[PDB]
Design a protein around this ligand. Structure first.
Ligand SMILES: CC(C)(COP(=O)(O)OP(=O)(O)OC[C@H]1O[C@@H](n2cnc3c(N)ncnc32)[C@H](O)[C@@H]1OP(=O)(O)O)[C@@H](O)C(=O)NCCC(=O)NCCS
Ligand SMILES: CC(C)(COP(=O)(O)OP(=O)(O)OC[C@H]1O[C@@H](n2cnc3c(N)ncnc32)[C@H](O)[C@@H]1OP(=O)(O)O)[C@@H](O)C(=O)NCCC(=O)NCCS
Ligand SMILES: CC(C)(COP(=O)(O)OP(=O)(O)OC[C@H]1O[C@@H](n2cnc3c(N)ncnc32)[C@H](O)[C@@H]1OP(=O)(O)O)[C@@H](O)C(=O)NCCC(=O)NCCS
Ligand SMILES: CC(C)(COP(=O)(O)OP(=O)(O)OC[C@H]1O[C@@H](n2cnc3c(N)ncnc32)[C@H](O)[C@@H]1OP(=O)(O)O)[C@@H](O)C(=O)NCCC(=O)NCCS
Lengths: 394, 393, 394, 393
């Protein structure tokens, strides 16, 4: 059978705004930071790591094609450790955790780090005609960030697929704005109560007035009210729109990681862990409706775990767009009070390749906060996919 | 862990930098080999549990969706998950491993593993373009050359090949020797038609009409030892040995294999090419990445319960003659069994697709000689190696 | 002999900061604005113009290679009028006036417009390898703005030549900072007293809060004191520097123009003009000391006019760098009280191709303000030149 | 207004787009013709009162200093003022006019007027690069093609040539006729060596050694009427006539003339080529800019007190056959006296240098036929024309 996977430690950066506090930190710099910190939290030597896997979508510089290896080596992991970068779009961060967990399940490693790192502020433009020349006529610089946010089959923004989902599943503008407002209020309450303090790694952000610690998610609106969202206009369609800048997730910068071990290695070391991995699942859907990806992925994961929706104490289902996040909660029959109890992509931001790892960290720390047992982590995936994993607080 | 069988495989011919495939995007090449492996195995596009593609250098936004685009446009149903993986030059074998693991773990009965890379279309980036440079000249960054630079010392992969040449005693004469033979083995393979069955031809619409690209165009068919010893070292100015002639080329290509669980294969009447025996990974000093295959291979043989002398076929990619010689040397391999039909130096090195492409070669060579065991291994920029062993069945 | 040239009207925009209030206004848009306004001030039909000449240095878009013609046609000048763009670097704006005056002197036109337009905020980057490709290796985007500010023989910033002049002519840091502070105080006094109101054309700058009129030079520091300049560090040399961001001219955006006529056409029409052109002169100097260009150019112009330094009531000598502006005043024996009485490039900005026309407008309006008789307009020129003209209030 | 004499002149051979001069910057070419005109006239670099160069498309930062760089690196003293002027395709004749005016007004006794343009090196710009694009694709702007677009309707100069073809009745057969003859006149001139004395050879360092570029390489020496009537219209899709064959090329070159006051020439013993008789400017409808030469020429003849039949040589640049035919037609010129040795269609159109270059041709042709009066005129994008008349002396 497959070895049991224990999540012993986890950490995330605070999430930076587009062009904001982390704009000068490369994806490999952020990844190295969370690698070194998870090792310290788990009391694991950098020489004792069997595998490193990082999720990451938008290469910002040549180093990023080496992202997992640079994050590992600069995070203090020995050079004998293999390192893999994976890309499943917005599912990449949770995919990294699954792929790292798989090396343990299969006996290839007793210790593995899975994380994600993304700096969208530093996403580049390309010049396709630069290598061999354009000769004559105007050419383009291609926005690789916006390009990543376009479905590659119809060349429509993710936000257009969110309208497709809104229309198909009956998710009104008012429903979307209610979810968005509530996400910000939940995030502001979590910040005010200190719910995120233990799971965040502060970053010193060298300012001209001296160094200051960036340790709070800066996308959150702390005094938001209903009229802030009603006044906004739809951003992705010219007719009959519902998706706005306020009820869509942000574009953001962050990194996060967990350190996992075989259950036997965790017993022998005597660690006091966060959780164990119960099950995971993948699904594919119509690309034009990629936002409901989490529905089949969650149903499959629950089947593998032998659990039911009502067994879930904590659900982190990323708010890519209120339009799809509502449809997911509705189609699954989830209690909105248990779903994203401290906010999600709309209020905290959506650093795409890191999101899936960062919301895993959130989920496991929330289980500890409430003494809960099972958490579900799931998210939708551009191109038409879903990914889901279930963890047990132990 | 379920048993994993390869039922089909295919590759494109390997295009030169700026050559016959320069107009074919990585997702275009990927979809072509996906469709072809399904039809070779006679497997419905609706029956695929997972698709994994290796790929390193994004040439356009669609490339961040590469596996999904290759799968959908290759005829795989939208309900199949798709993953792109990047372990640099090991990415193509990694995709096959990652796809096999979905089968081993019971997540899927059928999985496609492949790789796709178009280095000709590798882009230049402008890191200052989004928020501006404000004042002062700015950089147009060669993402292809940057992929070929170690990220810790910012030296070309070829500088690490020189390091490996010094440490292990690989001479210039030795490097040019392997390079010449590789070209001679490749030219012989092409003449005898050894690659015919494993290559998917591609129509490369020319002004002269509609021609088929089905031959690896990097090969020098008239090569003589003088051709290599005249060239000059290109990566270190003095006391150097790696040249353009004894180093792999920059190339474009795609390849894939389709795998199934043993049970699912039985239950479909599909004559499997081979079976997966074992795989392994290794990390090494980045400055000496070219020696990564040695520990990875040793670790793979250990897991397989096999010895070097049990290998009838070895596909060990020739990133640099300086590195490939030291691999063969440190492992104790018979050079007649290693890359018997050429490799990176002669056939080219389409980095993200290479590991999948030489897996296809290794398996077709096993069938050609009636062998049992084949080893596939390659080095990895940044300091790693990857290796896999297959059994002809 | 040569016909006498009357300056009947003139106008300038307010000067915008780098990245500031005029950043969205192209050079041909600004030029068209001042063309239409000078025609209106002089009561001259757009169908009665014999020639248009504009100074302009840094092309921002393809239209700018047609700059004079676009400014003329869009400013309401008939299509039968010839239009010429000239480039003598920072002397271009006054060169345009001289070249336009020359068509009148030679009997080619009885009416001619001379102006300058520059938007440095919109200066582009080029990609030299884009047309035919780079093939392999990194390339560069070339800053055409900074490039224009580099001497083309030694590839040193204009600011390095300013240090050369400071050293050769004994212009201390304290002397440079005294000039800079005084320039801002003079500009702030002129603004507070309304000295510039009649010569500036307001521009409506479409903001999100509604339209607002940009009519005040925004580079001026109104509460400047000596310590603001002493604290700054030298910007152009690593050793023994004196030139700073505070005592160097700014990078700026603006346009300006005058309308001239033959004296006979001015008599017949009965215009009430600003001034007449008395003389002009050019000079070349060592490129490494281009900042003293105005000295020989001024001496030559005075000789042609049969005037002496002491006959000058108003001097507009552009403050490119305090280092050279001091050396010019010192070598010529000018009274600093008469030189740039209302500020200059350090305080108001230096929109290079427009500066020479804009400070001509300043000079002629200042003559009217004080009832003076003769004004000198002069400036230094990258590559090692000077240009000067003398005008008489009539 | 003092009398202005031309004592010397020179031009480069005209390079094709991407051809033999592609590696020579505009300031490099400018300095070469500056040095050569000084030495041809035997005039000290210290004796020059003014330098003016026409030039349209900045290829690099130094180009904004073009006249000054051409003058200094061409041996002119640093005390000489230097001006760059831009009247689009008239810039090269404008520079000669502007330089002559400094002499006419007594500001100078000696002045150089020239032009320099390297369209091959014309750049792409990124208007968003300084302050950033933030989000969304951005433009890489072709500054060369943009220079060839009218700024009011954003149509190619060739679209205005079609407008001119309709208004004045210039047929396709008529255009291809002029194009063929131009090429035949140019090929004859080159064969007979007519351009030998006016061309400054340039060494264009090749891998085959050190070769001299001294022949206008746009010329088709084997041209036959079938070559032009087979080509298709390129600027309007339907009901079109201007083709790649009957339109001028995109080209690189430089040229200059040195002028002095009559007195200063006498006082130096310098045998002057010719004398400036008159010049004139005209504005026209931008949509019909190609007809600008007609009023400019009429206005120049009026000032000169001459008639069309007094002109022994006419250099009227062939921007487009459609436009040049209408110019000759509306002025009533003998086509045997107009561009007797080819022009823009056959020799090329290095825009900023053209007006200076064809002035050199016109003067050398006057000496070759013993003529008296020569006319130099050309059209101007945006709707202008410029014309000058010289007297052989
Ligand atoms: C929606 C989107 C196009 C907007 O981009 P943006 O303009 O850069 O976003 P910003 O927050 O900076 O600006 C939005 C504007 O609405 C306003 N706004 C946004 N949220 C608001 C809120 N909760 N309350 C009030 N106003 C709000 C901003 O203040 C701002 O107004 P301003 O210009 O006056 O300052 C972008 O965020 C996006 O694409 N999001 C989803 C990305 C995605 O697809 N992720 C993966 C999907 S699977
Ligand atoms: C070595 C390298 C820098 C050279 O690149 P390149 O110069 O553009 O390649 P080219 O073949 O176009 O040019 C090389 C020259 O040597 C010659 N040459 C190359 N191989 C030759 C051979 N086997 N025999 C004789 N001559 C040869 C070419 O003809 C060519 O000469 P030419 O320009 O006159 O026609 C590049 O191929 C490279 O980086 N290879 C290694 C790739 C790599 O790092 N892979 C992954 C690392 S793990
Ligand atoms: C000097 C130069 C390189 C500085 O460029 P810059 O950094 O963009 O200029 P800025 O005014 O925006 O910034 C300068 C800094 O000094 C400070 N500063 C400038 N002038 C100041 C003053 N009078 N008092 C106090 N502080 C001042 C700015 O506030 C700013 O500080 P900050 O970053 O904390 O806000 C540039 O202005 C230049 O090149 N000038 C001369 C151009 C030229 O050569 N023209 C033609 C020559 S012939
Ligand atoms: C017309 C124009 C757009 C064509 O540009 P181009 O296609 O890059 O020029 P090329 O010569 O490389 O290609 C044209 C094709 O027609 C053919 N051709 C051109 N002239 C020919 C001729 N006289 N006879 C036969 N064939 C000819 C070329 O061989 C070539 O064919 P190929 O590509 O198979 O070799 C460009 O030359 C142009 O814009 N000219 C006008 C310039 C201008 O506007 N000047 C100022 C205006 S006032």
């Amino acid at each position: 059978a497959a070895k049991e996977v224990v999540v012993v430690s986890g950490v995330r950066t605070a999430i930076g705004d587009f062009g904001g506090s982390l704009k000068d930190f490369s994806p490999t710099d952020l990844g190295a930071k969370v690698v070194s910190e998870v090792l310290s939290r788990a009391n694991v030597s950098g020489d004792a790591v069997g595998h490193v896997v990082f999720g990451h979508v938008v290469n910002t510089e040549p180093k990023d094609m080496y992202l997992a290896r640079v994050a590992a080596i600069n995070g203090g992991v020995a050079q004998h450790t293999p390192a893999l970068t994976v890309n499943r779009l917005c599912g990449s961060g949770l995919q990294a955790i699954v792929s790292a967990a798989q090396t343990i399940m299969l006996g290839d490693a007793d210790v593995a780090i899975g994380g994600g790192s993304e700096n969208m502020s530093r996403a580049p433009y390309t010049v396709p005609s630069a290598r061999f020349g354009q000769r004559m006529g105007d050419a383009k610089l291609v926005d690789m960030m916006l390009g990543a946010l376009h479905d590659p089959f119809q060349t429509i923004h993710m936000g257009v697929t969110a309208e497709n989902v809104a229309r198909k599943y009956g998710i009104t503008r008012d429903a979307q704005d209610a979810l968005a407002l509530e996400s910000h209020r939940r995030a502001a309450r979590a910040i005010a109560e200190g719910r995120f303090k233990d799971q965040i790694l502060p970053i010193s952000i060298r300012t001209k007035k001296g160094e200051v610690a960036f340790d709070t998610d800066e996308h959150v609106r702390h005094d938001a009210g209903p009229d802030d969202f009603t006044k906004l206009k739809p951003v992705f369609v010219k007719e009959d729109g519902t998706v706005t800048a306020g009820n869509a997730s942000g574009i953001n910068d962050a990194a996060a990681a967990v350190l996992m071990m075989s259950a036997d290695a965790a017993r022998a070391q005597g660690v006091k862990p966060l959780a164990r991995l119960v099950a995971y699942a993948h699904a594919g859907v119509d690309p034009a409706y990629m936002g409901i990806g989490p529905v089949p992925a969650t149903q499959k994961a629950l089947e593998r775990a032998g659990l039911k929706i009502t067994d879930l104490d904590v659900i982190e289902a990323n708010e890519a767009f209120a339009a799809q996040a509502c449809a997911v909660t509705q189609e699954l029959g989830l209690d909105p009070a248990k779903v994203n109890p401290n906010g999600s992509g709309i209020s905290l931001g959506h650093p795409i390749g890191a999101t899936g790892a960062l919301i895993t960290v959130k989920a496991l720390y929330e289980l500890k906060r409430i003494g809960g047992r099972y958490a579900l982590v799931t998210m939708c995936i551009g191109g038409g996919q879903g990914i889901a994993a279930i963890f047990e607080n132990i």
